[PDB]
Structures are given as structure tokens and as C-alpha cells.
Amino acid sequence: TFQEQGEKEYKNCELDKNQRQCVEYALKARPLRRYIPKNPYQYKFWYVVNSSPFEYMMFVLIMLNTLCLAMQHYEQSKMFNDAMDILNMVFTGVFTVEMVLKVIAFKPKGYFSDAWNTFDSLIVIGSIIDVALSE
């Protein structure tokens, strides 16, 4: 009842249903921003940050944290708990290192452009506020 009435527009004098959206999106469009600074003395870091193998390693390094989290169980041993603590410390430290290495290349001024880009900064900031209350 919504497939008919919903799309019951009869403007298809020459154009079919395929042209009902593509032409409109062509009319309403705008190129994005890539934010490419040359900056030779940090261009190496800039290239390292934005590279396919780097993200291919980031994926398998981030999923390891979740795999570590999906291991705690009831009445677990003390050594296992300490291993969990040290793994958490390693993960938060490496996240801080990657964040500080990324912000230099991508600059603070453009760091708020992407929603996920600045969200990770709060994750690192949040993961460090309670770093001293554990011990």
C-alpha cells in the first residue's frame, strides 16, 4: 500500500524510475575536502598515518582488545586478572601513542572534521582518567 501510493508520482513523462534520483543527486552535490598539506619534515608521518597497511594493522590490533575483553569469567584467578590489567595498560598506551602520532600529521584544526576522528580522542582521554584508581 506504500509501494504504490508511496511512490505514486506521475512525472515519468520521459525518464524512468532510475532517473528519479540520479539527476537530482547530480544537481545537488558538492566535492569533499581532502586536507593534503605538503610539509616535507612531517610528510613522512602524514603518509604513514594514511596508508592501507597501517589501517589493515589497526583493525587487527583493535579487535584484539575486544577479544581480550570477551575473556573475563566469574571467580577468575589472580594471575589471569593481573594479565588482563597489564593487557589493558598496553592497549591504552598504544592507543595514546597512535593518537598522538596521528594528531601531529592531521593537525588539531582539522581534527574535529571527522566524527570518528575526534571521538577516538575522547576514548583515549576517558581511558586515562581512571588509570590511577585501579592500583
Place this chain on the structure above:
Amino acid sequence: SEYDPEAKGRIKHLDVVTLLRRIQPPLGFGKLCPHRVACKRLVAMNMPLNSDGTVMFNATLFALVRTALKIKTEGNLEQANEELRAVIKKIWKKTSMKLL
């Protein structure tokens, strides 16, 4: 936007060959040699009479859209403009360059 740090509206014509080669076969050109299809297709199809190295993004995406479906012969190009101005929503004076 891969080659453009920002929008900048227009790009140079030197990289147009690489731009058209870097598109998927369904949208761009097939794996065959571009010297036979791409070079003739880009010249034969209607393009705006802009400068040597300043072509707007809307002057290329619209051309690709026209080439993709119901491509029309030369001379009758005003029929498409009339169709957009009479069927599609308001142009907001954006088709002034797109007419050519």
C-alpha cells in the same frame, strides 16, 4: 577529491585520463585499451567550452550521468535542458553552464 585538497571547483585536463581510467568498468571504461574507446568517447560527446585546464566537477559528473543512460545525439541537447527545467525540481540557476 583524491587529487584535490579541497573542492576548488575546477581541475586540470592533464589528469582527466587517469581520472577516467580509475573508475570501475560499470561506470568508467573497461579493462581494454582506452585509446580506442575513451579517447573517441570523450571527444565525440558534448563537453562545455571551458579553458584548457579548468573544468568544473558539475561539468563532468553531469556528462557521465548523461553518458550512462539515454544518451542523446548532438543538436537536440536543449531537449534535456527543457526536461530538467520542466520535470526535475528547481534548477536554482545552476544549469546556466550545464546548458553547453
